[PDB]
Amino acid sequence: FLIDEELLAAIDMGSNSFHLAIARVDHGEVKKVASMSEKVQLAAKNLTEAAQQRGLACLARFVGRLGSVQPNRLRIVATNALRQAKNGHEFIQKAAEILPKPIEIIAGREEARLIYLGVSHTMANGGRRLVVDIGGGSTEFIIGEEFEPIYTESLQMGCVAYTKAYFADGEITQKAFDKAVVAARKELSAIATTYKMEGWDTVVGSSGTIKACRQIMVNMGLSDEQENVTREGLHKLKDKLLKFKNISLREDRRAVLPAGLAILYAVFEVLEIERLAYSDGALREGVMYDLLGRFKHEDIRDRSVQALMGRYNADPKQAERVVNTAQYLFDSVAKPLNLTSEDSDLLRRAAYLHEIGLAISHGGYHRHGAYLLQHSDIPGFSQIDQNHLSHLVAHHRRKLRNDVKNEVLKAGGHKLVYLSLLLRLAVLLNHSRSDQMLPAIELTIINDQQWQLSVSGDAKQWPLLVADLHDEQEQFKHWNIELNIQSEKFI
Amino acid sequence: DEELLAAIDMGSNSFHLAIARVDHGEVKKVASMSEKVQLAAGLDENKNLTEAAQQRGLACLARFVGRLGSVQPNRLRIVATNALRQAKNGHEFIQKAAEILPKPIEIIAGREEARLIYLGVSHTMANGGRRLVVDIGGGSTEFIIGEEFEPIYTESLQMGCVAYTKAYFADGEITQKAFDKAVVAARKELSAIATTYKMEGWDTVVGSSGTIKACRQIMVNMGLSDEQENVTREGLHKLKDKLLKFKNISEIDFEGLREDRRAVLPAGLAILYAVFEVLEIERLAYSDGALREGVMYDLLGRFKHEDIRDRSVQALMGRYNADPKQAERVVNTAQYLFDSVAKPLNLTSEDSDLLRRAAYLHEIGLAISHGGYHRHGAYLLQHSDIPGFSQIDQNHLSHLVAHHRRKLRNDVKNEVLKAGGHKLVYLSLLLRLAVLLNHSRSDQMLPAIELTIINQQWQLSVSGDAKQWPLLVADLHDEQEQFKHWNIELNIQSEKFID
């Protein structure tokens, strides 16, 4: 109930264990306040109830600890799990009962961005750094300097899938190692030349597979003075593992160890890495420092938005007119609709990006813009946050159909529908594009599935709005909303 | 004969034909024919072309062909605009045409159309300065701001003389009420581009169209024009006034008004009147240049190795930050393979150029996402306005980029076969090999021996030092399995590829 505006939390739902970390902002730095780690093992393609409830409780304990954090400074994150879950949406729906902020699945080149950010703020060695992270479904490779990455890539070669495909039954074979390496070499063949020419002064790893290998290196005296995993020690570990005949350290880790061991051996050989450090912070720290930017009002999502506008040459003065009108409409319905501070940001971005499909074609640009936002690698945007952004651009013009309205409701409920509607009104009013002055009062109030738009001014100027707003009533009706227009003051 | 050039424009109201010959640095017109086909009027409420309209269309093309027997099919282009865009049965009409035409019909997008209209008007009234070109057609209206022979803005609005009569003057009755509805509807259309266009501004306005042609004639005959014989703003206001003094189309008595135009004059007048008002035009001049000349000029650039299609390719590379080094390597590998199989597969230079442009563009999708970029680049190539590219051309382009990368399925092949037949299929397969051979991005000398041979079964032989290319053979064996999913046996012989 007591709320601390400098408090920042972040929940990370891993494969075998979750984690909650709380922290506060002291002079632009992130001071640790709490850390809790609960093993659920829900991930280890339909999440069984034998662990689903175990997580829903773990999350309800966490949110009770999180009672002092503003939702603006809270972030839920997950990876390589609910992706491969038939009932994943149901667990998210069950978690949405529990948590106050929707789960976020971070993957691919966004996951890579966050590992490197977290490694960069933890280990502070200067220089061109290569970060590697062998996840369960995917292995991230980043070259960056300072906190700014240069190349970010995600190779679909995780330790879980490699065992499932080459080391199934858990039987260790000479050929099964070579086969797993060969698959890994072929994956790396896409980025090796680019990454090697670019070069690195330091090599840092992350995720469990790297951690496990680092330990056995130490325990088997195969590590280095600085516990730097070395090709020599790694190659020897490879030969020692081939002596086993089956899996039967850590009990959970030995299951995927053959896959991982080959993946790192392949990485070491194809990129000619000699020495490799380990960072535990992983993506958990990335999300926290991401959260710090949002606190500092330097959100990367915002910076990406302005970058997308420049790639697609969107009209800045038209974006400005749209985003202002939308805010005014947003504020005028803020309390009744119960729209959050996040929702204002969603609309602000979408209003900036709504004309981007115009760089593809002038017909159906709203559908094109949506395809771009749905599929692009936009740094800072997660899967769900992209999907809401594209949805707002996808329905800002043309006809509305109840069939799609249901799809929108599934994606982000009535709040996404209301924003989609607010964006429709904010474009419709700037359809004339360059304008002398506000064509009318355009005052929006709400009742219940019935909105009221009041219009007042010289109707002789801007005489299309009346018809436009009446054409818009029918489309609203297709989304179960009765928009009534008061033009009695517009004449 | 071999210097002869021809173009057929299948419009909404009329089909046009133009023949020309390039004499030294000048092109001399040989023939210019027109025929009323009224394809637009043949569209049903289901936007379906009546058999009567297709037969009129097929009768006119059979005559045009009769007059084209002495022009190289490589030096002819047949384009089609709004009425075939709209038609739901347009594929039927085109496949009925394919049996009588030497060259396939190419539907072209509105903005491509506006571009070629700009060309033909440009080369007519050649006056330095920024120009607004308005073309009121049967189904759509093209607005182009440009300078010299180069458009700055192009737009294409769904308003026209035949569509608007069907909606507001179907019976033939002229009522201020119906005329205002026709003006308001066109103002709605013009609103989408108004302020943008006006901001850009112009020094001169030219009109190209039968609607504009007929208004300029009736306004000079009735003394409503000016010294330069231009459609003025005032002459329109008066022409509108005396138009409304009639109550039916049958009683229009304007001198210089063809009988076939009285039906569509009211709606054509309403659109032009709304154009003049919304864009605040004061004087418009008429040009005989049109999509017909534009196609000829577009052809002249291709004959001079100045294909705007190649300029558009380089601009897209720019916009999607495509690696120019990878692009060249693939381009060069693709041309090597192409030359080793072009005779057995009966591939022409046009095929070659399609593979060349796809090769320059196969990685534009990386600007969207590194995952599935081949699909995302197909999406851009398929849905973008790309100057110089007809719809059929873009589509084959997007197919080449779309299949170049991952797993191949037999149902996709049949979609390819419907798009561009067996040639499209081979080009997609050559592009694949070209990328695969350059997948490492090595800038090293590829295994000296890359001989592609054809026997429904292809033979790829490799010979040289295998030291620089350690996974080439395994990527080739992986490609054999994809090649069989498209019913082709790729035979890999690497016995001399060693070390």
Author numbering:
A (entry chain A): 4 to 47, 53 to 256, 263 to 505
B (entry chain B): 7 to 461, 463 to 506
Question: What is written in the article reporting this PDB entry?
Answer:
Degradation of polyP into phosphate is involved in phosphorus cycling, and exopolyphosphatase (PPX) is the key enzyme for polyP degradation in bacteria. Bacterial PPXs share conserved catalytic domains 1 and 2 belonging to the catalytic N‐domain, and most members of the PPX family contain two additional domains 3 and 4 in the C‐terminal.
It was observed that PPXs with similar lengths of α‐linkers presented similar types of dimers: the KpPPX, AtPPX, and HpPPX (9–12 AA in α‐linker) showed a compact dimer configuration, while the EcPPX and AbPPX (15 AA in α‐linker) displayed a relatively loose dimeric arrangement.
